[PDB]
């Protein structure tokens, strides 16, 4: 009964955490924000349409200058666009055609991508010859690359389908830190604005908070019912939002250690593929499987608007750093800039 | 603004050079058909691959009648397939290899393949993808049924009241006991496919073996039939 004794203590500790969360739940976010003004009707129009991909698009990432973005499609191409003029700056052919994620470095010098080959490949865009070549490819993951985010020109945090996140040294190609604890495929990660913590959502209906320096898990959140496909921090870094397959987006508080609000509708029965916040954080944009994107009131849980312009499943979202526009990628091989 | 004119013209020229290259890649993409190789671990995965001849994916290239095919084998992934199986929704066909002799094994490898085929057939992103079904291990199935060891009806009680279909083509020199073993297993997969087909995707079953050396011709013929019915859907304008 030694295994049962360890299970009893695990069950006893879970009740202690649940009671401590209930003791702090003196009110709700919907009660406090009851008397504020409604956001009103949000109506965005498509400003740009980016064409050139031959197959479905899985990921995109905005640049820090809010002008250039990179997109990854399963035709084996990485395309860097100029969203102001709809011009293609680079077109990188990939060794593997099953890319599932892409990242843009905050310095603008590198672009990373990965997929079913279990390898994160770094591409140098500032070569003296003028061509884009594979600067470094990182190996060591035993599952598919699902997300990756640069910390700087020398570090990058990657999630993978082997229930494990990792931190890499680009110069040496070695794993500096390994983050373990999830029991499902980690589908998304988001970096905190101070780049000292990051959250990850996996296929165990759970989200975890990690310490980059210490390599440890701090808090665990278990509000959802199905696999979490997307995650994104609040702009102030004290909260985050998750999207899942149960047709529900939720908001979690780091300091309160519990779920704050649930964003759902009776006629929505499709999963969420991507979530993102506006610059202020008042609006929460979520992409869905019914080909639409919904805008939510983050403080009132009221749907504000619909972005209906895609003929196939919306796979990725992104809001610029200055908050001017939001970009949607879909499975119809198109990118749209909404504003 | 003279330098701004040069920057826009240089950006326009670089866009024109990229679009010239993208036109060539579009022709290569159109002229090439991608396939997914899938099935249980105990079946003849290398048997199908060798008929032509750490990493997360393996690629096999072959050409039949000047038509290029890419076949992809999932190398190093976990058994939880519900997330990465969505990347193969636009392939021409999914090649599903089933060890037909493993109706009873140390457990039910055939029921695991039937449940896996049921999820692939009824997945919302795979409802337009055709499946080419290869029922392997004909010699092993013939040895098991004829010798009388084990049984099929202990794991499939409907086998006792099952008869040979009228539209059957038995190979010469085989008793009518191994033949019913093949067709009952084929009809188990066909009952799944005929329930929720709706004219979007089709299943092509074949009785492959390790010494056939002609499975590339059957894949080519079925892929030719898949493309034909995709072209027929454009004539229903309204």
């Amino acid at each position: 009964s030694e295994l049962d004794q360890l299970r009893q203590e695990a069950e006893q500790l879970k009740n202690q955490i649940r009671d401590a969360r209930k003791a702090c739940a003196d009110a709700t976010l919907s009660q406090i924000t009851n008397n504020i003004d409604p956001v009103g009707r949000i109506q965005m129009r498509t400003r740009r349409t980016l064409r050139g991909h031959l197959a479905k698009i899985y990921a995109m990432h905005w640049g820090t200058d809010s002008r250039l973005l990179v997109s990854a499609s399963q035709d084996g191409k990485l395309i860097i666009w100029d969203s102001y003029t709809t011009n293609k700056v680079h077109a990188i052919p990939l060794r593997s055609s099953w890319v599932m994620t892409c990242a843009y470095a905050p310095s603008g010098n590198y672009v990373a991508c990965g997929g079913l080959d279990n390898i994160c490949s770094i591409y140098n865009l500032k070569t003296r010859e003028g061509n884009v070549r594979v600067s470094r490819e990182l190996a060591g993951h035993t599952g598919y690359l699902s997300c990756c985010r640069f910390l700087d020109d020398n570090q990058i945090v990657t999630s993978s389908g082997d229930t494990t996140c990792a931190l890499w040294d680009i110069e040496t190609g070695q794993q500096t830190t390994t983050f373990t604890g999830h029991t499902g495929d980690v589908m998304s990660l988001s970096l905190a604005p101070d780049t000292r913590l990051f959250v990850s959502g996996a296929c165990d209906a759970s989200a975890k908070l990690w310490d980059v320096r210490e390599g440890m898990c701090r808090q665990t959140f278990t509000g959802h019912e199905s696999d979490i496909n997307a995650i994104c921090f609040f702009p102030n870094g004290n909260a985050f939002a998750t999207g899942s397959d149960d047709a529900t987006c939720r908001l979690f508080d780091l300091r309160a250690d519990q779920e704050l609000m649930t964003y759902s509708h009776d006629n929505i029965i499709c999963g969420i593929t991507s979530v993102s916040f506006s610059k202020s954080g008042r609006l929460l944009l979520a992409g869905y499987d019914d080909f639409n994107c919904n805008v939510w009131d983050a403080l009132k849980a009221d749907r504000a608007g619909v972005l209906a312009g895609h003929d196939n499943r919306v796979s990725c979202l992104g809001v610029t750093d200055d908050g001017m526009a939001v970009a949607t990628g879909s499975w119809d091989s198109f990118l749209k800039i909404w504003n | 603004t003279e330098d701004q004119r040069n920057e826009e013209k240089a950006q326009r020229e670089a866009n024109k050079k990229i679009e010239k290259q993208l036109q060539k890649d579009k022709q290569v993409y159109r002229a090439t058909h991608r396939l997914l190789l899938l099935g249980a671990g105990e079946s003849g995965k290398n048997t199908i691959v060798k008929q032509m001849r750490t990493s997360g994916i393996f690629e096999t290239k072959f050409q039949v009648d000047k038509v290029n095919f890419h076949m992809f084998d999932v190398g190093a992934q976990r058994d939880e397939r519900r997330k990465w199986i969505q990347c193969f929704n636009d392939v021409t066909a999914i090649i599903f290899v089933v060890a037909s002799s493993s109706y009873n094994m140390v457990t039910n490898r055939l029921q695991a393949a039937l449940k896996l085929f049921d999820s692939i057939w009824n997945n919302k992103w795979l409802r337009d993808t055709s499946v080419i079904l290869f029922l392997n291990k004909q010699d092993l199935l013939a040895e098991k049924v004829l010798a009388g060891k084990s049984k099929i009806e202990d794991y499939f009680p409907e086998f006792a009241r099952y008869t040979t279909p009228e539209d059957a083509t038995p190979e010469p020199g085989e008793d009518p006991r191994v033949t019913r073993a093949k067709y009952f297993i084929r009809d188990e997969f066909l009952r799944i496919s005929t329930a929720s087909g709706d004219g979007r995707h089709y299943c092509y079953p074949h009785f492959t073996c390790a010494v056939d050396t002609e499975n590339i011709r059957r894949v080519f013929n079925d892929c030719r039939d898949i493309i034909q019915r995709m072209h027929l859907r454009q004539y229903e304008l309204l």
Partner: nanobody
Amino acid sequence: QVQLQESGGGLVQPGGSLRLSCAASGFTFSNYKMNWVRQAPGKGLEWVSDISQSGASISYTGSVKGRFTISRDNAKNTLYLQMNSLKPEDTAVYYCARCPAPFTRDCFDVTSTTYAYRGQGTQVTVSS
């Protein structure tokens, strides 16, 4: 937090009957398809039976058809499996497994090891 708790297993003589229960919490029980799976002491995980969201769509594996009966109670979030005329090869750890997504026809990774939406299981022993 999604949680599944099984009960009702135990030692039983050959030809005996056992009723298994699966208390569910943390999710809407009526929106999901439910499964029963078992793991033999030497073999791997094997699918046993399933029932749809509202019932009326029941399938068993070949070895248990006509002897096992799966039942659902959406009002109380309980899943049942009525075992009748048990055999010594039924000795396994029976798990109550939930399909990953609601309003779906397919259930992919139910029998896959390290599955998140599966319970701890109960031991069923058939011996004399």
